[model samples]
Target chain A: EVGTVVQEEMKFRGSEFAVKVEMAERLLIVEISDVVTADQWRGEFGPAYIEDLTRKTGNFKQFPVFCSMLESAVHKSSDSVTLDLLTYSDLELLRNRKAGVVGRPQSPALSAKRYLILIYTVEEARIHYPLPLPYLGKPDPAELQKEIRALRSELKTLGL
Target chain B: GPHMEVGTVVQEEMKFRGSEFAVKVEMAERLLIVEISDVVTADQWRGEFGPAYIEDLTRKTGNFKQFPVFCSMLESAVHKSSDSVTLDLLTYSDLELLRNRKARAQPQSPALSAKRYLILIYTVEEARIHYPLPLPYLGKPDPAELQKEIRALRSELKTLGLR
Candidate 1:
């Protein structure tokens, strides 16, 4: 049932996991991995879906909250603007994932570097931030870098 | 929590099942949002769902909401680029959690109440979870070094492309 089926990795907080991102029409539909047994038992008995989601996915737990933060930001800002972010350990993992995609999985640190990218309009900005659950082995750097690059790609793809 | 529409002239481009919840869309009053129905936890849903369902269901429904993100993007799209090509605007409901977090953090610091400040604060919040820096030494530094540091950070990441 497998045929080199394409898979991508997304980072949340510091953990990286294999993911499935489906780009349909106007949105990037993401299905993040949450393979932890604790998340399984917790959601089974827990009433706090979104709350538990936050814990499971770390800061990425709630879609609504993340969307709102983005929505409100874009809706309120003036013109499109580019923002700068520094390199952190986890984000470098994004650079490494590209490596992983190619079969040359470099240790996450080599990919470490801050970047600058263009962003246009408010909605594009709103759509940018936020993203996953605890396959949390903590992280080795590259996570934040992945987030920023992923966002930069997204806004550009939308032609914003 | 309350009843209101984003707008009537709004359009629905695409819809899908995210994890287990259904995503719906409404556009009006400059608010384009991802709407959630049939809520489910992040656990089993992630375990069960995959790219195939998202691609297939989204085309089938061909319509969807949350409250504010997309319609704004949509309305602007209709106005800006004729990139009228449909797109997948995912993650509709669940921002209520953001409001809750923002609310609790509000009194803790006056900065959280403002949109620009709030966005950066929230960014820091998420940043802390994965790659944390000393939260204290980060924001508007000690009075001794405050002047130059604020100039540096504010010059760098504070505001641009987003408004």
Candidate 2:
């Protein structure tokens, strides 16, 4: 819908839209159409939206721990992809629309965080280094602290 | 471009709606990992589609008698990058976890107990989408680290009648 052209036909559970990708200054920029408009103009912007989502949904504490599990798995001497899972709410705004390829809204959408992944580029067929966690975001300190306290207490009782 | 069974577990490239996606399927850590990738611009993403439609479509049309439970493990829509390409990590696993949790959550739903097992599989996937973390282990709790302890405690609490 903007200056960039639609690269291919993309469908996320019935909400279809054009996708445009741009790389600038060591950052990857992606844009998708939610109806006629391009995104909500700076309302939701970031390198990785997953962290933002976890913070908003009171999962800031668990998210990094989950990522570290992947990191540990990926760091092994053997060639492999270590993995875990996180759930997130996405394309809600676009889902609200009833026109075009968008489907009717249920109470809310539920999808896996693992569904969206890309480590291989044609130019770089093989990965030689550890992959950075995608859609990473920061956490609120106060909330994080509370979660930590609960976890520590549980761990203590768990006795390991 | 070539024909492969819809439920074939292998690494290949398939086109969905004319978009090329690199699909990788394999077994890791006792779980089925299915990854799909397409290098296209990321756009904001969400919504629900027909669970019944999907279930019937998968079983009747795809001829998937072996792959019981199918659901997304990761998605590019949530990646939140402008230039980040499209990627999806879907999964397929046995129905033991699905059925076990279903039994515990509602232990006595006549309607659910009446429906065939495959139909209930989508319900489990739908439930997991909303609550991914703190997943419960079915049997002798294979406990791990911080997250594992958290799940352990949560499961115990649920057993103690907490939601």
Judged by lDDT, which candidate is best? 2
Model 1 per-residue lDDT tens digits across residues A34-105: 222111000011224434534543233243443233233223343443222223434454445534654224
Off by over 4 Å in 1: A1-34, A37-137, A140-160, B1-31, B34-108, B111-114, B117-163
Residue B10 displacement in candidate 1 (angstroms): 15
Top candidate when judged by DockQ against the true structure: 2
Model 1 alpha-carbon miss at residue A98, Å: 40
Error of 2 at A115 (Å): 8.8
> Tens-digit lDDT track for model 1 on B1-163?
3223444332222223333322233443433333222222211011111234323433443322222322333344322333332232222122335435654332334322211100101112233211100111122212213222322333333234354
Query: What lDDT would each prediction earn against the true structure?
Result: 0.29, 0.31
Note the clash tally of each candidate: 52, 22
Return the TM-score for candidate 1, rounded to 2 decimals: 0.16
Docking category for candidate 1?
incorrect
Report lDDT (Cα) of residue B98, candidate 1: 45
**Cα deviation of B60 in candidate 2 (Å)?**
71
State the lDDT at A3 in candidate 1.
16
Chain A TM-score for model 1, please?
0.21
